[PDB]
Design a protein around this ligand. Sequence first.
Ligand SMILES: [Mn+2]
Ligand SMILES: [Mn+2]
Length: 269
Amino acid sequence: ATYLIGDVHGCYDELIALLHKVEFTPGKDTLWLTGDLVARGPGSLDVLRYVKSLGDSVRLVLGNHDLHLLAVFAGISRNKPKDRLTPLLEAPDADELLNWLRRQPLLQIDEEKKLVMAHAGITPQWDLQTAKECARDVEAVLSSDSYPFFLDAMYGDMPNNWSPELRGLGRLRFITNAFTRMRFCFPNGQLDMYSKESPEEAPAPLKPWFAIPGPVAEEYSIAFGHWASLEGKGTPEGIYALDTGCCWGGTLTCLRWEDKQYFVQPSNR
Ligand SMILES: [Mn+2]
Ligand SMILES: [Mn+2]
C-alpha cells in the first residue's frame, strides 16, 4: 500500500502512532512525506533518523523548514530556539543525517499513479517538464559541495513570475519559493509571498495556487503539505492538502492512495 503523510515537524510520537494505526510495513508499503520533517515539534532528530532508515520505502520532498535546518547547519542562518533544532544539530550523527537530507528531491512523480508531490504544490505557471527541470536544477545545487552558497542565496521574495529566460540567482530563488513557500497566486499565476491565511481570508484577486488551472493539475493528482491554515480543506478534486497542523496542536493526516482512505492522529499537545 501507499501512504502519504503531511508535515511532521518533529512530531515523532504521532508519526509512529499513525504508521502503527495503518500497520505500515516497509517492503510491502511505501510512504510519501510532504517535507517539513523537522522543527517546532520536539523530535526532529528521531524523525530524521527514522525517515533516513526507511530507504526506498520512503519518497520525500524537502520543505522550507528542512532547507532552513540545512542553512543553520551550514552556518548560513541563525538558530531560533523556537524550532527546537539543537538536539539534532548537536547529535553525533548530525553530519550523516543532514548530508542525506540535502540530497533528497524537491519533487516526486509516480506516472503509474498519475501522482505528483511537492512541499507547497505546483505553480500553475509550470508544465511537468519545466517542474522536473527546475527541481533538478535546485537538487543539483543542494547535493553539491557548494550548497551553503545556494542556501545563502535562496532567501528572498523576488522574482515572483516564472519565465524560461530567468537566469542565475533569481531563477533559483523563484524555483525554491514555488516548491517550498507558495500559497496564493495572482490571476496570472504570479506568486504572493506575504499572505499565509486561509483562502476565505485572503484579499482579492488572490486565489490559492490550485484554484488556477495549470497544465500539471489537469493531468495529475497533486499532494502537498506546507499550508497549515488550509486545514486540509477546500481543495478541488485531484488536489490533496495533507498538512493539518500537527505541531500546532491539530492533527497528523495519512492518506492511503489505493482507496483514498484517511487516517488521523491527534496532536499529543
Ligand atoms: Mn510546515
Ligand atoms: Mn512549509
